[PDB]
């Protein structure tokens, strides 16, 4: 079947499973992450690196930064499941909207390796920044999709 983007959800809400590769709390976020999440050097982010699968096929690598203040608490156990359901059901976080950017590109050497493909084959680069309902950014995510396993859909109006 097919991934739906319209959806500000987790992918979990489109079957899915995950290898968490990194989870950590960073005292000083990357400068890109400071910009994107309207942060400074001082306030903490969580970083999460996940390999996602759909029905046993590698779907993408996901690079996520979360604003600890807004999200309140994450750990790698909870990173094994749906972050979005944890956020709504446990943390009771009111997620409002999101900006999505994407383009097609060639894979890097290491990316082709992660996604068991060859250097330079196609991929989709997908960025998403999630906002709370009061406009505060809390999640900046970058995904590189496996070009044969990722199929997308959207309904317009």
Nearer to Zn ion, 20 or 112 (CB): 20
Does residue 136 belong to the site contacting a second copy (CB under 8 A)? no
Residue 153 contacts residue 2 (beta carbons within 8 Å): yes
Nearer to Zn ion, 18 or 123 (CB): 18
Does residue 126 belong to the site contacting Zn ion (CB under 5 A)? no
Q: How many residues bind a second copy (CB under 8 A)?
A: 31
| Only segment of 30-38, 50-58, 69-77, 119-127 that touches a second copy (CB under 8 A) | 119-127
Q: Could you tell which of a second copy, Zn ion, none binds residue 10, using a CB distance below 5 to 8 A set by kind? A: Zn ion
Of 94, 74, 70, nearest in space to 83 by CA: 74
Total residue length of the chain: 157
Helix or strand or coil: residue 42?
coil
Nearer to a second copy, 73 or 101 (CB): 101
Which DSSP string corresponds to 51-117?
Answer: EEEETTEEEEEEEEEEEHHHH----HHHHTS-HHHIIIIIS---EEEEEEEEEEEE--HHHHHHTT-
Write out the two tokens for 132.
Answer: 């709370």
Give the one residue of 52, 67, 71, 82 binding Zn ion; rule: CB under 5 A: 82
Give the one residue of 34, 81, 98, 114 binding a second copy; rule: CB under 8 A: 98
* Residues that bind a second copy in the complex, under the rule CB under 8 A: 2, 5-8, 96-106, 121-124, 128, 145, 147, 150-157
């Amino acid at each position: 079947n097919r991934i739906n983007v319209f959806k500000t959800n987790g992918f979990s809400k489109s079957r899915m499973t995950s290898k968490v590769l990194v989870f950590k709390e960073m005292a000083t976020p990357p400068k890109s992450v400071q910009d994107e999440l309207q942060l400074n050097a001082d306030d903490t982010v969580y970083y999460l690196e996940r390999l996602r699968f759909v029905d046993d096929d590698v779907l993408c690598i996901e690079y996520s930064y979360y604003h600890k203040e807004i999200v309140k608490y994450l750990n790698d156990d909870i990173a094994k499941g749906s972050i979005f359901d944890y956020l709504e059901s446990n943390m009771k976080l009111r997620i409002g909207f999101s900006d999505i950017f994407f383009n097609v590109d060639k894979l890097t050497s290491s990316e082709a390796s992660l996604l068991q493909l060859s250097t330079g084959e196609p991929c989709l680069r997908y960025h998403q920044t999630f906002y709370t309902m009061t406009g505060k950014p809390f999640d900046s995510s970058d995904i590189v999709f496996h070009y044969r396993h990722a199929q997308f859909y959207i309904p317009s109006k």
